[PDB]
Amino acid sequence: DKGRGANKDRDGSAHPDQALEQGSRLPARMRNIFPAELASTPLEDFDPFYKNKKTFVVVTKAGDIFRFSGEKSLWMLDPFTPIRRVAISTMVQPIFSYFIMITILIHCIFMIMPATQTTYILELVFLSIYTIEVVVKVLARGFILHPFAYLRDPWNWLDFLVTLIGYITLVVDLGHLYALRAFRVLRSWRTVTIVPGWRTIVDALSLSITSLKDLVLLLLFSLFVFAVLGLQIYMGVLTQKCVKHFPADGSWGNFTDERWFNYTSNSSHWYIPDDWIEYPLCGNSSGAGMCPPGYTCLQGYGGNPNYGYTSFDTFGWAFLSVFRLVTLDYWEDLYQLALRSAGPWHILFFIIVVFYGTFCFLNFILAVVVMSYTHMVKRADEEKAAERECVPWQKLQGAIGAVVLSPFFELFIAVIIVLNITFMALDHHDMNIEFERILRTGNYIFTSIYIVEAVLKIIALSPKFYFKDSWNVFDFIIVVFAILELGLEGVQGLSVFRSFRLLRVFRLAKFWPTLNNFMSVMTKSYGAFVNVMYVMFLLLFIFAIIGMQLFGMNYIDNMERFPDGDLPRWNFTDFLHSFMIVFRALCGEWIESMWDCMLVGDWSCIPFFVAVFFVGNLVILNLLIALLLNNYGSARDSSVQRMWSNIRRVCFLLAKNKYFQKFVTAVLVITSVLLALEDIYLPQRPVLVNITLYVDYVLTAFFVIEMIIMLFAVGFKKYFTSKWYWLDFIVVVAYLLNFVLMCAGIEALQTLRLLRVFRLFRPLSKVNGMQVVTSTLVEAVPHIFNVILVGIFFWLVFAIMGVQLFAGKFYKCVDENSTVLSHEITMDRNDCLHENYTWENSPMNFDHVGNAYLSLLQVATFKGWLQIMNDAIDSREVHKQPIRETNIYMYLYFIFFIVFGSFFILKLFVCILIDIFRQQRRKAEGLSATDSRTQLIYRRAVMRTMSAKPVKRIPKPTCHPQSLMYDISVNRKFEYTMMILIILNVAVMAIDHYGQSMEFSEVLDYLNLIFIIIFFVECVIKVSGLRHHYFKDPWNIIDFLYVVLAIAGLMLSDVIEKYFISPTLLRILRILRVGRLLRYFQSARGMRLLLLALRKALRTLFNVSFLLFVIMFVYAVFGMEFFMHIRDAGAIDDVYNFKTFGQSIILLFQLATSAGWDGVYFAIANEEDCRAPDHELGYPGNCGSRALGIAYLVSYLIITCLVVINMYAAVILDYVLEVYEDSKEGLTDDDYDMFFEVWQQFDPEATQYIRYDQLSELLEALQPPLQVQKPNKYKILSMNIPICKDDHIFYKDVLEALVKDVFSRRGSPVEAGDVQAPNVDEA
């Protein structure tokens, strides 16, 4: 409406429409003394063929509506209808505009090469093309205002802006920068338009990003507290190397002052085991590493990790690496190196950082993306809604037709394939001569069947008609390329014809049900999907070519700061590297690039790989979840019976009861809590050896009675029946076997007795939340295993591909200490086996299908897929040796995998898990009848109204001038200004470097002294004022402790420490105050809007927190009795083992997010060495666990990284959707709170009334939309406001009346009666 009004005004008012370009015609507004072709209204045709065209255009417009016109608007100064006008007309019309795009696409193909041809001459061409074009557009429209409008309308912003700089670049200073080359390429962001609709998504990401601007102001604070924490805990913790002491009475030193600081400073003796290029962080808080013997562990000695840029000291680095954590990225180092350093207690920090920041604040962005995406599609549905509304031969033929119809044919068809699928499904490297010949026989047999089935159908029914069915068209395309296949391999050459065998595999979709369904919905977005796709490449391409010319000539020139290497594998030299390195950062690892970039490239790289992360991953790759979500929304007869009643009242009586029931649950806990402290060290000196064995017997004594009393009490028929009572019977089974082997026998079957842990489940669902989350898991799992059947399927395609070209390779020559030699000594399996030595494999190969399958999953979840992908590049024949650079075009094989694997399927687990979780909230709280999303809003408002009664208003004790104190405690001066002090106290901590002069130390000591005195005043003025309402007041309790500890700290003095304080918690409690601010944010109301959200979720969000704690505790104990001694090589550093119960959780929180599960897998799949465990005197158990691993990690990553950690996401995006939902319609919770705030003001003594005369003021004292501003008497008098004598009004009459107003002030129509009905019901 507003837009329309604006348009009308311009038609009026003081803009001019110069031309309207419509359907290849430029129709011509002029000049209020002067014309050209004003009329008709109506489909006339006054003049002319031009006239006719105009008429046609008009007609089209009337049909259509707005669509589509190109408006050039005008005055302004000059130009009536010769030369400028003509020019304008030319520009309006569209094939020219098609031109400039081309010269745009021509630059892209020209820029992507290298430098090569120096046509700078051809470079000079395209500028002059655009120099003309910069001229046409400013000539069309006008003059100084419209260069001011040419600034203005913003796609055009980029055509001027960039091309001045492209004009600048001819200008020559070769002085300073070559940044002129930098921003040249941005031109190609035009090319989005091309392709077709273009508009929800470009307009998605535009509405995606400028809503997130609010939210960014959150996390820029959100990071800034924790990087402080890291600064303040972790400062120069992350430099503990391990240094020797002395030759004591030896050779070096005496007086240990200027030489002990010298003998430790030299980087020649501190510990390295075997060239692990960096330096091996140590510890000496117990548990946390250490470090081998004759040593000790010092802090401040040279360097720090990856390339000097990990550590938490010096604030600005502490920002980057903490922001690493919120990304959840390669932290497998920054995990471990910290715990080698400090201790195994500091995951309690890393839970905060990862749990609180990056499990919230990466969802909060997805929250914004999906909301902004849905808001534009429903906006785009309005266009979608409006535009819609001989005899023998004959007999034979008949027979053929019959067989086509039959239950015969498709069956045997679907047989032949599930068999043919199986023939391609072997393709070994070894593949015995007889096996090879079998396989070759397989296809000539099976290819003929295809032609026959195909040759007969076409003949059985109707040629021209036969090509109506696309599947039969698809069926025909098989055997055309099948008969292609055969000739090449008669003929002799070549190669790629073979993989069109894999086009067969698709034939299966028609025979499926679930899969024709799945393939069908994407045939809904042949468009939306590929449009989303096209920008993802474009944005990335935009960053690819700016990366090359920008970082660029640094990799080749410097060349030597790298770890004694010439170039790394992920550089910025050509396009394909510089496309791959930017794509690597999109999926998201982006540090190891950005070490590698900044090490050599000085500064400017830091903005670039954060700009590829936000704009790349959190904006695009969360958008691609919103695409899948909006598309895939789919006497003894009585006496024994009296005993049978006595057993019914023994059991059914005793059974419902809490007091036994909790007695069972408590026991399962402390029995399983005993089960934690088992292993390696049980045989420690056998107090637990014995009780773990007592608890063994006396548990099974409790489980067999458990089983009687449940057996008889509830239900014979339905006890043997259902699932959670199955898991009991099977425990009781299971502990029955062990007794069975205490005498007649003997061993403990260990794993039988570990299904005791399995029953802790159903205390857990009962807990005061998980009822929601549980119901959403065990419901999920049917639809999950529907996706998975699918997700096999595409991987099944991609795998057997990679066998047909990958299989056989991955066999590099190696001397025993692992060195790929290089070349020239190597290049076949002869010259490495003819010398003597060891032509050996890489552990994640593509030899089999299951070997190729698992090794594809490492590139699925982006772990260890650098390490595959280098070897994959390098390999170039079956029995020859792989070389470092060659065969790099098939590094694009992964890109056609990683899209159709990782973003389209691995994130499709999210678009199941959100669709289920909205429904389970409906069956908690709600219904399924409303279903149109408004009635439910109304009901929730009604329930919110019914809720609150009032504050007390902590109302005064009397005096001395104690009264003063409460005149300042509640004031709006003191809370700001004392709070303002807390933000001051923060920024103190922000200044601090490592070890820093005393000069700085004296200052911070001085300033810390100041602030606590003011705080000590804050406390007692706060204390004397409210006193007990202090402690109903959460922050102040915290605000109280840090004060008290400060007096503990600084006051008496110390002596000694520990025995109270020490410096961790003192500073921790000081930082925890700064979260007082979320109270104070109420300013711009989109950001307090979303944080109300967070609390609405946190209690269900803690609940999911517990399952993750739990199925950790599950799989640690269950793995632990699997994963006793197993070497170590390569991510169980002999501190991060499955040995104890501590590290088994330290391990698995790494695996929780699935960061570093390859190198973990590589240990538990390591089969080389072993001394076979004898179960005798002796054994070194340190041996192996293949099948015991695959069925563990894959059973972990599906459970943790797929469902439950995305279940984490489904909670936040439900609630944050619900909240913007209310706000749109509606009435958030903030509003209700502010109402009672101001109600308290007017009703201090919580009488729950208010006087007649004060009502008007109360209606004035509210925030919109509840607020009825003065004058308001005539409006109030409108609402139903009953008064009790004498002239008092009750609150909820007021609440009801006021809230009923607002939905009025919102709306009209039919909701309202619904609302009324709801109210009535409530009453």
Ligand X SMILES: *[C@@H]1O[C@H](CO)[C@@H](O[C@@H]2O[C@H](CO)[C@@H](O)[C@H](O)[C@H]2NC(C)=O)[C@H](O)[C@H]1NC(C)=O
Ligand Y SMILES: *[C@@H]1O[C@H](CO)[C@@H](O[C@@H]2O[C@H](CO)[C@@H](O[C@@H]3O[C@H](CO)[C@@H](O)[C@H](O)[C@@H]3O)[C@H](O)[C@H]2NC(C)=O)[C@H](O)[C@H]1NC(C)=O
Ligand Z SMILES: *[C@@H]1O[C@H](CO)[C@@H](O[C@@H]2O[C@H](CO)[C@@H](O[C@@H]3O[C@H](CO[C@@H]4O[C@H](CO)[C@@H](O)[C@H](O)[C@@H]4O)[C@@H](O)[C@H](O[C@@H]4O[C@H](CO)[C@@H](O)[C@H](O)[C@@H]4O)[C@@H]3O)[C@H](O)[C@H]2NC(C)=O)[C@H](O)[C@H]1NC(C)=O
Ligand U SMILES: *[C@@H]1O[C@H](CO)[C@@H](O)[C@H](O)[C@H]1NC(C)=O
| Positions at the binding site | 332, 589, 592, 864-865, 1156, 1158
> In terms of DSSP H, where are the helices of 469-574?
470-491, 508-511, 514-522, 528-550
Residues in Cβ contact with 322 at an 8 Å cutoff, skipping those fewer than 6 apart: 223, 226, 227, 230, 312, 353
Of residues 254 and 470, the one with the C-beta less far from ligand X: 254
CA distance 525 to 532: 10
Q: Considering CB distances under 5 to 8 angstroms, the limit depending on partner class, which of ligand Y, ligand Z, ligand X, none binds residue 816?
A: ligand Y
Asked whether 123 and 115 are in contact (CB, 8 A), the reply is no
**In Å, how far from its chain's centre is CA 242?**
38
CA distance 510 to 414: 10
CA distance 496 to 484: 11
Question: Does the footprint of ligand X cover residue 249 (CB under 6 A)?
Answer: yes
Of residues 301 and 331, the one with the C-beta less far from ligand Y: 301
Question: Does the footprint of ligand U cover residue 836 (CB under 6 A)?
Answer: no
Q: Considering CB distances under 5 to 8 angstroms, the limit depending on partner class, which of ligand Y, ligand X, ligand Z, none binds residue 817?
A: ligand Y
Q: Considering CB distances under 5 to 8 angstroms, the limit depending on partner class, which of ligand U, ligand X, ligand Y, none binds residue 815?
A: ligand Y
3-state class of 246 per DSSP? coil
Closest separation in Å from C-beta 810 to ligand Y: 22
3-state class of 561 per DSSP? coil
Question: Does the footprint of ligand Z cover residue 233 (CB under 6 A)?
Answer: no
Of residues 830 and 1082, the one with the C-beta less far from ligand U: 830
* Nearest residue to ligand Y on Cβ basis: 817
Of residues 129 and 298, the one with the C-beta less far from ligand Z: 298
Amino acid at 310: T
* Nearest residue to ligand U on Cβ basis: 830
CA distance 350 to 1148: 13
Q: Considering CB distances under 5 to 8 angstroms, the limit depending on partner class, which of ligand Z, ligand X, ligand U, none binds residue 296?
A: ligand Z
CA distance 224 to 218: 10
Q: What is the DSSP letter of 507?
A: G
> In terms of DSSP H, where are the helices of 614-752?
623-631, 636-656, 658-676, 687-713, 716-719, 723-739
Closest separation in Å from C-beta 257 to ligand Z: 6
Question: Does the footprint of ligand Z cover residue 298 (CB under 6 A)?
Answer: yes
Q: How far lies 1220's CA from each of 229, 362, 677, 913, 1217, in Å?
A: 33, 18, 48, 21, 6
Nearest Cα neighbor of 1161 from 1177, 1185, 1144 is: 1185
CA distance 236 to 242: 14
DSSP letter for each residue of 938-970: HHHHHHHHHH------------SSHHHHHHHHS
Q: Two tokens at 953?
A: 């208003």
Among 268, 997, 1083, 1280, which residue interacts with ligand Y (rule: CB under 6 A)? 268
Q: Considering CB distances under 5 to 8 angstroms, the limit depending on partner class, which of ligand U, ligand Z, ligand X, none binds residue 249?
A: ligand X
Bind-site residues for saxitoxin: 332, 592, 865, 1158
Among 13, 254, 268, 394, which residue interacts with ligand X (rule: CB under 6 A)? 254
Count of residues in contact with ligand Y, rule CB under 6 A? 8
Closest separation in Å from C-beta 322 to ligand X: 47
Stretches 65-73, 265-273, 400-408, 1237-1245: which one binds ligand Y (CB under 6 A)?
Answer: 265-273
Question: Does the footprint of ligand Y cover residue 448 (CB under 6 A)?
Answer: no
Asked whether 1026 and 954 are in contact (CB, 8 A), the reply is yes
Question: Does the footprint of ligand Z cover residue 288 (CB under 6 A)?
Answer: no
Q: Two tokens at 571?
A: 């550089």
Question: Does the footprint of ligand Z cover residue 290 (CB under 6 A)?
Answer: no
Among 388, 723, 834, 933, which residue interacts with ligand U (rule: CB under 6 A)? 834
Among 381, 469, 815, 925, which residue interacts with ligand Y (rule: CB under 6 A)? 815
Q: What is the 3-state secondary structure (H, E, C) of 29-90?
A: CCCCCCCCCCCCCCCCCCCCHHHHHHHHHHHHHHHCCCCCCEEEECCCCCCCCCHHHHHHHH
Question: Does the footprint of ligand Z cover residue 1064 (CB under 6 A)?
Answer: no
> In terms of DSSP H, where are the helices of 804-909?
829-833, 850-860, 865-874, 893-898
Among 40, 60, 265, 525, which residue interacts with ligand Y (rule: CB under 6 A)? 265
Among 266, 296, 397, 422, which residue interacts with ligand Y (rule: CB under 6 A)? 266
Closest separation in Å from C-beta 834 to ligand U: 5
Question: Does the footprint of ligand X cover residue 258 (CB under 6 A)?
Answer: no
Asked whether 1139 and 768 are in contact (CB, 8 A), the reply is no
Q: Considering CB distances under 5 to 8 angstroms, the limit depending on partner class, which of ligand U, ligand Z, ligand Y, none binds residue 830?
A: ligand U
Asked whether 416 and 479 are in contact (CB, 8 A), the reply is no
> In terms of DSSP H, where are the helices of 461-507?
463-466, 470-491
Q: What is the 3-state secondary structure (H, E, C) of 1124-1147?
A: CCCCCCCCCCCCCCCCCCCHHHHH
Among 249, 637, 816, 1286, which residue interacts with ligand Y (rule: CB under 6 A)? 816
Of residues 254 and 1280, the one with the C-beta less far from ligand X: 254
Bind-site residues for tetrodotoxin: 589, 592, 864, 1156, 1158
Among 131, 296, 441, 819, which residue interacts with ligand Z (rule: CB under 6 A)? 296
Stretches 294-302, 605-613, 864-872, 1169-1177: which one binds ligand Z (CB under 6 A)?
Answer: 294-302
CA distance 1202 to 784: 10
Closest separation in Å from C-beta 825 to ligand U: 13
Closest separation in Å from C-beta 1049 to ligand Z: 22
DSSP letter for each residue of 964-999: HHHHHHSSTTHHHHHHHHHHHHHHHHTT--SS-HHH
Stretches 255-263, 802-810, 982-990, 1130-1138: which one binds ligand Z (CB under 6 A)?
Answer: 255-263
Q: How far lies 1052's CA from each of 366, 408, 1048, in Å?
A: 52, 95, 7
Closest separation in Å from C-beta 877 to ligand U: 13
Question: Does the footprint of ligand U cover residue 830 (CB under 6 A)?
Answer: yes
Closest separation in Å from C-beta 240 to ligand Z: 7
Closest separation in Å from C-beta 231 to ligand Z: 18
Asked whether 894 and 871 are in contact (CB, 8 A), the reply is no
Question: Does the footprint of ligand Z cover residue 870 (CB under 6 A)?
Answer: no
Q: Considering CB distances under 5 to 8 angstroms, the limit depending on partner class, which of ligand Z, ligand Y, ligand U, none binds residue 266?
A: ligand Y
Among 256, 495, 841, 962, which residue interacts with ligand Z (rule: CB under 6 A)? 256
Residues in Cβ contact with 228 at an 8 Å cutoff, skipping those fewer than 6 apart: 318, 986, 989, 990, 1071
Binding mask 784-823 for ligand U (x = CB under 6 A): ----------------------------------------
Of residues 131 and 830, the one with the C-beta less far from ligand U: 830
Handedness of CA 1024, 1026, 1029, 1033 (dihedral sign): negative
Q: Considering CB distances under 5 to 8 angstroms, the limit depending on partner class, which of ligand U, ligand Y, ligand Z, none binds residue 256?
A: ligand Z
* Nearest residue to ligand X on Cβ basis: 254
Question: Does the footprint of ligand X cover residue 1321 (CB under 6 A)?
Answer: no
Closest separation in Å from C-beta 254 to ligand X: 3
Residues in Cβ contact with 1182 at an 8 Å cutoff, skipping those fewer than 6 apart: 1125, 1126, 1127, 1169, 1170, 1171
Closest separation in Å from C-beta 830 to ligand U: 4
Of residues 173 and 249, the one with the C-beta less far from ligand X: 249
Residue 971 backbone zone (phi > 0: left; psi -120 to 50: alpha; other: beta)? beta
Asked whether 886 and 780 are in contact (CB, 8 A), the reply is no
DSSP letter for each residue of 1027-1077: TTTTTTSHHHHHHHHHHHHHHHHHTS--TT-SSS--HHHHHHHHHHGGGGG
Among 134, 297, 318, 586, which residue interacts with ligand Z (rule: CB under 6 A)? 297
Question: Does the footprint of ligand U cover residue 267 (CB under 6 A)?
Answer: no
Q: Which residues bind ligand X (CB under 6 A)?
A: 249, 254
Q: Which residues bind ligand Y (CB under 6 A)?
A: 262, 265-266, 268, 815-817, 836
Q: Which residues bind ligand U (CB under 6 A)?
A: 830, 834
Q: Which residues bind ligand Z (CB under 6 A)?
A: 256-257, 260-261, 284, 296-299
